[PDB]
Amino acid sequence: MAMNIKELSLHELCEELKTPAWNVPLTFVGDVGGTSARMGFVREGKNDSVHACVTRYSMKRKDITELIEFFNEIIELMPASVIKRVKAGVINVPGPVTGGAVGGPFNNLKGIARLSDYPKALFPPGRSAILNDLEAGGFGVLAVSDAHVFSEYFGVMWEGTQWRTCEQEPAGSVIGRGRCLVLAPGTGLGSSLIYYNPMNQQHIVVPLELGSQTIPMRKDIDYIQTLHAELKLLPNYENMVSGAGLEFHYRQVVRGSRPPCSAGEIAKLASEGDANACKAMKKYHEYLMRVGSEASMALLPLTIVLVGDNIVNNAFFYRNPQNLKEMHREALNHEMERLGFQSRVTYLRQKKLLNLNLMGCYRCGLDLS
Amino acid sequence: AMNIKELSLHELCEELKTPAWNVPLTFVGDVGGTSARMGFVREGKNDSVHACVTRYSMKRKDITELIEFFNEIIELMPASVIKRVKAGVINVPGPVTGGAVGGPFNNLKGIARLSDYPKALFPPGRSAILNDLEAGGFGVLAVSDAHVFSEYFGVMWEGTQWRTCEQEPAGSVIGRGRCLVLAPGTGLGSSLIYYNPMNQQHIVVPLELGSQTIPMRKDIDYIQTLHAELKLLPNYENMVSGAGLEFHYRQVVRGSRPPCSAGEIAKLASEGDANACKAMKKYHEYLMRVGSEASMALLPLTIVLVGDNIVNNAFFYRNPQNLKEMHREALNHEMERLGFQSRVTYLRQKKLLNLNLMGCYRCGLDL
């Protein structure tokens, strides 16, 4: 198995790291959310495989600075001869970062993440970084490709016209050298651009805020104006492509005929074949394809990849050939499709669960060491 | 400290035989639809940059004619001069793959092939073909590197983020952050100069922001008027172009006055013509919308307006009423309730300089 993540108690992780398979160079990684952080060590295995061993920490204090207590505990317990093998340290945090070194402020945690405050044993000077969540997720998409298992984690929705002229291998078998736009449609709408720099021979991940752009119209001015009047804000893409957005689409389908439902209730009903909930899901995806059509022009990506547990869990929607045909039509609904811009782009969806952020911390670390 | 001199081919040959030019050289070329400017760049004191170039007519409208120009320069130039060329980089008005294969082109026949160029002007591992947008962004980096950003760029307004990561004045350097380059000219070019915080590297990423569908503000009727004329949903370049300015002038007059060209409109505005000034306000209103939306999408530290058109229209930006109205539209975004649009420092090119030629040079320093 190419991508392996094992969760252990700190004491069991210490025992695991003394085993012979772990007597190799190590990367320290940390995936930090509002409730818990998973932190530990990653090594290479056979055939560019990835093996992580992590421990779950509760963010009891809802303070980012508590991470320093967790780091200090790992360095106190672990033999110095084991920690000596760490060549890089990278964590992801749910908020903005400057200089790859200063994270926050955060919506759901107090304090600021400061790399210069972290122990050099786990964060070697010059070989360390703090990443935003969706930067780490981009690097995680790269990590899957590098481990030769893109076709295990991602499914092709449709192959674009540019793939075969730019790449030798089948669509969806590798990320491709071209620009890759990562979209994370979930409760919100995350975005990042994976760029390959030919001069460097280095891939870099550019975090974006595509979801906060004002929605440009097609033939839907009355639909956008309905949401405008409700929010008292000109709609952005996240307003239509979010849990709140899906709840709105469901209200507009049923027009008071049926009780209001949560985003989770709507997804479940669509999965059970409820016509109203399926229509609401079509509307959600119509606006996701608008982000995609406009970014296809602005950013000239080779590929668009939809990531996240939400995308995996909603596989039923993407597997339906009618739904996929309607999504493809809206992806090509742009004036510049007369010149083939939108049809150039290959669309892919995550089809298997994976902690992309932990794998991305590792992949970023390889650039740094 | 940045110097580009235009010469005849004969004068260029004589200049390159003088002692100031007995130093390593970069061969550069800025190729457009009508003409190309090509020649040689050297370093001087204090990271200064000195170029000497000649104009070629693209008579045949054929990109392969460049090879005849290259062969003519090698025939004419002493072997001692050509020997000093350590790198060769040209820019072309179309897509490039592998930094080696340019085109097809909208306005020229044939394909630009670096493999077909003479190694005397394009030494191995030290040569490239660039897209024009990429060259322009490298050019912005070249100005900053030569310490003369404050000579070539004027601050329109300083945003909140500059002093949080730079102690020197706004406009003194490109800045350790993303720089969005807009080139509002006949059309509207765009590139993102990404900043990689982990290695302090700027990386030029060409974009197509001009081709995005315009999102509305309170202007649905105005967008629909242009829609009905073009039979296309308007994009930003439709409003921010020569053709766009001409449209804005038609809408201002409301049939009172006949059409004028983009050039005539700018001249009238410089003379204080109220109608032409209103046309220019509308043009800049849509330019600031590209800016407000990209300020959110791309989180730039700076937006820099570049090109001969921007320099030649400096009157418009020096009028404080015009500048205040542009600043208001730059902040006309829902996300400005969280300060996003206010973060960004806006600058305009205020002195003529071929950024494409400078970017060919700067790209060579990265090769």
Side-chain angles (χ1 to χ4, degrees), chain A residues 42-45 47-59 61-333:
Chain A
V42 188
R43 69 176 173 82
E44 196 188 330
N47 303 344
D48 311 297
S49 59
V50 177
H51 300 262
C53 185
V54 297
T55 300
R56 187 187 171 287
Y57 288 90
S58 301
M59 306 285 295
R61 301 204 294 95
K62 304 168 189 59
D63 192 352
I64 201 71
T65 72
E66 199 174 10
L67 300 175
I68 296 163
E69 297 162 45
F70 307 159
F71 304 150
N72 286 342
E73 178 170 63
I74 294 169
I75 293 167
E76 285 160 6
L77 275 66
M78 199 86 52
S81 55
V82 169
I83 293 304
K84 179 169 175 204
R85 294 193 309 266
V86 169
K87 60 164 173 186
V90 179
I91 67 169
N92 63 269
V93 295
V97 184
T98 67
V102 175
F106 301 100
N107 296 331
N108 299 323
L109 296 169
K110 54 181 172 173
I112 297 302
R114 296 184 186 284
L115 178 56
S116 64
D117 286 340
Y118 298 174
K120 72 182 166 189
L122 290 184
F123 294 93
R127 291 147 286 171
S128 298
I130 306 183
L131 301 182
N132 167 264
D133 278 3
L134 298 136
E135 178 156 350
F139 275 117
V141 173
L142 269 171
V144 172
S145 184
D146 287 355
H148 315 301
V149 296
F150 216 71
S151 76
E152 179 182 343
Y153 286 94
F154 298 101
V156 170
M157 292 164 63
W158 54 85
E159 180 177 334
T161 66
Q162 275 282 333
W163 183 265
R164 282 178 187 261
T165 299
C166 300
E167 297 294 329
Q168 287 81 9
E169 294 307 313
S173 69
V174 298
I175 187 168
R177 286 293 190 72
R179 302 178 184 186
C180 175
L181 172 63
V182 179
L183 301 179
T187 299
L189 177 50
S191 55
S192 70
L193 187 64
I194 310 173
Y195 183 81
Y196 175 68
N197 186 0
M199 317 171 79
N200 264 6
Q201 294 92 29
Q202 182 187 347
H203 286 264
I204 66 185
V205 177
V206 179
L208 303 174
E209 300 285 349
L210 297 189
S212 297
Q213 298 166 290
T214 310
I215 305 179
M217 78 186 192
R218 289 299 187 277
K219 296 176 182 183
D220 56 341
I221 187 67
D222 294 342
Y223 198 73
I224 291 173
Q225 291 289 64
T226 295
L227 183 59
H228 187 185
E230 173 172 313
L231 293 179
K232 314 292 185 286
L233 295 170
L234 265 187
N236 66 34
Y237 289 113
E238 189 169 48
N239 294 140
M240 293 294 192
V241 183
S242 58
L246 184 61
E247 294 157 3
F248 170 82
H249 302 306
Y250 186 78
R251 288 188 306 268
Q252 299 308 301
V253 169
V254 303
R255 313 193 184 273
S257 78
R258 295 288 297 269
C261 286
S262 65
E265 294 165 343
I266 294 160
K268 190 60 156 72
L269 282 171
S271 84
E272 298 171 351
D274 187 72
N276 292 329
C278 292
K279 195 158 151 81
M281 290 274 284
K282 288 189 207 83
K283 262 282 180 279
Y284 168 106
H285 289 90
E286 172 181 0
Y287 286 100
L288 179 61
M289 293 301 103
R290 197 151 325 147
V291 178
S293 72
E294 295 291 345
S296 292
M297 189 64 244
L299 306 182
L300 299 178
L302 180 65
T303 66
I304 291 174
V305 179
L306 314 179
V307 300
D309 298 344
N310 196 31
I311 293 300
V312 175
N313 289 340
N314 288 349
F316 74 90
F317 187 82
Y318 305 108
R319 290 199 213 107
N320 173 304
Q322 184 57 38
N323 298 335
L324 197 62
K325 187 177 74 170
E326 286 168 12
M327 278 185 279
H328 176 259
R329 170 177 180 175
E330 285 299 323
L332 264 50
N333 186 6

Side-chain angles (χ1 to χ4, degrees), chain B residues 14 20 28 85 144 149 161 171 197-198 238 266 310:
Chain B
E14 294 308 293
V28 294
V85 171
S144 181
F149 215 73
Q161 191 175 92
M198 292 181 290
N238 293 146
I310 296 294

